[PDB]
Amino acid sequence: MVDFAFALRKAQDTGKIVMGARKSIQYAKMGGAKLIIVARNARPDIKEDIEYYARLSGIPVYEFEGTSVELGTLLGRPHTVSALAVVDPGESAILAL
Amino acid sequence: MVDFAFALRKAQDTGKIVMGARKSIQYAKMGGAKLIIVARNARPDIKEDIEYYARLSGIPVYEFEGTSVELGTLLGRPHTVSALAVVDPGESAILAL
């Protein structure tokens, strides 16, 4: 990952992202996302859940170094965000390896 | 992941793959691979190790449903293979989501 916060902003403004543990799980499970992002302190059960389905389908998982509070802030949401999925990167390089 | 065994064969024959736990760890750690594959029964410490570094860099990890013995067989190696990395997919669709 390169310049995560910038890449995330670019995806959010120009692409399509979906926020929340359940929705991200639905994606890791069913497909339909290009990348799942988890907060470092996302509750263990949620992280393991996402990680299991992500390995099942080969969807990449990226751990945001910071907290669910910091991730919510980065996303401009009035609440914590523990996980999200990138459905379309838009003009972002967030998927670049 | 779609038609894993076929996709893997195509990457192996037309792209670049690297086999082994240490080499895959080096990739998950330093970048340079597009996908890490782990056998279902790869020893837990090795899986966790790869999985940690993969999350650090957002490199996708795919779990092969079968054993390290079966994975070695699939790769035509005379030994078990617990993990590998796809450096170049070649003509393969192994990276498609």
Numbering used by the authors:
A (entry chain B), B (entry chain A): 0 to 96
Task: Paste lines from the article.
For example, we have shown that the thermophilic ribosomal protein L30e from Thermococcus celer has a ΔCp value of ∼5 kJ mol−1 K−1, which is much smaller than the value of ∼10 kJ mol−1 K−1 obtained for the mesophilic L30e from yeast. To study the contribution of charge-charge interactions to the thermostability and the reduced ΔCp of thermophilic proteins, our group had systematically removed 26 surface charges on T. celer L30e by single charge-to-alanine substitutions. We used the double-mutant cycle to investigate the effect of pair-wise interaction of two salt bridges (E6/R92 and E62/K46) on protein thermostability and ΔCp. Since thermophilic proteins tend to have more salt-bridges than their mesophilic homologs, our observation that salt-bridge reduces ΔCp may provide a general mechanism for enhancing thermostability - thermophilic proteins have more stabilizing salt-bridges that reduce the ΔCp, leading to the up-shifting and broadening of the protein stability curve.
We have selected two salt-bridges (E6/R92 and K46/E62), which are located on opposite sides of T. celer L30e. The crystal structures of the E6A/R92A, K46A/E62A, and E90A/R92A variants were determined at resolution ranging from 1.8 to 2.0 Å. The root-mean-square deviations (r.m.s.d.) between Cα atoms of the wild-type L30e and its variants were <0.5 Å, suggesting there were no major structural change in these variants. The values of ΔΔGint were in the range of 1.9–3.6 kJ mol−1 for the pairs of charged residues (E6/R92 and E62/K46) involved in salt-bridges. The average values of ΔΔGint for the salt-bridges E6/R92 and E62/K46 were 2.3±0.3 and 3.9±0.3, respectively, while the value for the control pair was 0.6±0.3 kJ mol−1. Take the double-mutant cycle of E6A/R92A as an example. Removal of a negative charge by E6A substitution from the wild-type L30e resulted in an increase of ΔCp for 0.8 kJ mol−1 K−1. On the other hand, the difference in ΔCp between R92A and E6A/R92A was only −0.1 kJ mol−1 K−1. These data suggest that the two substitutions are not independent, and the pair-wise interaction between E6A and R92A affects the ΔCp. For the double-mutant cycles involving the breakage of a salt-bridge, the values of ΔΔCp(int) were −0.8±0.4 and −0.9±0.5 kJ mol−1 K−1 for E6A/R92A and E62A/K46A, respectively.
